[model samples]
Target: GLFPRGRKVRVVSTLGPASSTAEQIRDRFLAGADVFRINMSHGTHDEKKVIVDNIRALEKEFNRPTTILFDLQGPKLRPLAALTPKDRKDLDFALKEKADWVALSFVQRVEDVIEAKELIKGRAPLLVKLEKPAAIENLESILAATDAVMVARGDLGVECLPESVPPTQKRIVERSRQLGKPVVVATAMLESMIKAPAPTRAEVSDVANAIYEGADGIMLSAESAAGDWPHEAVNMMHRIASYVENAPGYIERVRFTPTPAEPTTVDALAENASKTAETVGAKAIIVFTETGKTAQRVSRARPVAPILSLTPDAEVARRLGLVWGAQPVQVSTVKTLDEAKKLAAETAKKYGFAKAGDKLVVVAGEPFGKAGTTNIVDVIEA
Candidate 1:
């Protein structure tokens, strides 16, 4: 099932009371959920297991590629509470069983990220939830240490002044884009809608404003979790994002790195691919990834075109859902450049992103399937 229009901006909907069954997951997917979040604040290991089982089933049954984000609860910083033994067990399961992200809560320092990295032991990717007012004290360091960052305003509003969350959001977005990091502005965007079918005018503006400020995506907390209308909430986000992007005089904001100091060969190519593709009017930016690193780096550039990420590993495909602008597709691994060409063209044609003559910008690495080797980019007429 598809919608009237496809959005470049992504939507991440949390799965909870309103959306826990397979049918419910399918509904949210059809309603335009690019990523599904699993809240760790509740649910026993078996409880979470049931949901993951269904998600994997849908991936094969419907041939749909979906990403899962795990949101764990925490302290103001230096997390006062350690992960429960059950939580630790579930975290390991998620990392190995195809969870794309684990959201470490209340992280206010770089050391917190380091601790989380050690906790996960490289099993899964981490998203640092920035909420504490003290987070500003080590903001740069935290950003440097985490895979991604979320402006978790729910706690920020409580931890800091309620009004302070908005300004802090702007500053975080600015710093994130400057470093080519993926940032999500979340919490309370559509709070009123948990009970009501529609959101207030102010709520709608708040979401649209986050988009205008250059956040990769805006998240739905209670709006899609315990809310009465989950799909409707997702649909509303799609509309709000579309309105902002298509509004009068909307030029694709270009703040991605034009020149990264001491860049690698792949970094330079990714920069060129994004810049050249936009200038030449490309339909999409295509990337072949191993660890999802290639796709992550390319997304940091924030190209005007949507990123078509192809990976052989299902886990990698799902992990990419956390990356901004990355639309992951699972495909058979290709070993050579010639194989890469075939895969790119056929994928483009099938996805309706490009046809016989539409232009596409392809990025990948040689010695195929090699991680961190994104040293290739080519323009192709599909």
Candidate 2:
């Protein structure tokens, strides 16, 4: 059985006072952090840069292809002013803010996106934190603009009504996957385990639900970032995901489903091409996406094969990396579809994912550099 097989569920840990140092980061990586998430919400840009620099340096030292996630604080959704904690002797006053906290006001315009993107400079992948109502309303445009997205449910719940958050969360995940962009469902997947030796049954179900929802990755914030038992938290998540993966119909339930494109020749051609590639039993699907919209649509269709996304921008690659069943490979934009196919095949083969005679589904557009105009798909053997 493939069900019980350990199919590497990536773990992303946030760097804070507890896990900020180089040694701590290395240990976290060794422990289980397949991806290191640098939360831009807390630290200064210089501080974030140093951490990024350190991680890059260590990647060379460790000789491992560890992915870095630059989780941007898209916007803040706090009250008009900060709330001061008053003396309430009987009640616990500790404000444990998870890394997913959104200051909704943070992301107001294109400049914020540009600033955050510029700071990362392709050193790592960027996951735009959409935690406010403003971000949700602008999600399509935001997803169109950013590399990947995280539905920061914690602050979202705080900002919006609790009853509204879940649907919004689902919408965000679905939208990101539909756009072929990777979506991470974060904040409190196993919150109970922050202090407990084991997660509560409800917490386990919470995680299982995310897996069921087809999230590329489920995130543990304070549980791994500032919790007393980070290792325990990681171990618990591994157990839950493994159990769910082995569950009957899990894959089928989470499989992607392609949608009919709008009534336009180019859109219809691209949709048909993608469906054709899936029908041919290709081992992997590769798409050159800028805004990642075409890629998301392919992912939503839930092809059986893994999606190998080649993006000129590192942010797109990083964000897609978080998507479930989508393996992102950062590459330069090539002039021709043939060049793109060759690049895709070479990159996939290098990763030991595909080989000669293995069929790869390649998707892109005619003019070649335009965003959201994926008009072609070809099945080619290495």
Q: Give a tens-digit lDDT track for model 2, residues 138-227.
A: 677777766666778787787789789888887877777666556677788888877887888888887887777777677778887787
Candidate 1 residues lying further than 4 Å off, grouped into runs, are 1-5, 76-90, 252-262
**Tens-digit lDDT track of model 1 for 2-46:** 422365566888888888898888877777777788988777768
Give the range of the ten consecutive residues with the poorest summed lDDT in model 2: 87-96
Shift of residue 243 alpha carbon in model 1, Å: 3.3
Alpha-carbon runs more than 4 Å astray in model 2: 1-12, 27-35, 40-46, 58-149, 158-168, 175-182, 235-239, 242-247, 255-274, 289-294, 312-316, 332-341, 365-373
Query: Each prediction's Cα lDDT score?
Result: 0.78, 0.62
Which of the numbered candidates is closest to the native, going by highest lDDT? 1
In candidate 2, residue 374 scores what lDDT? 71
State the local distance difference test value for candidate 2. Answer: 0.62
Clashing pairs in 1: 356-382
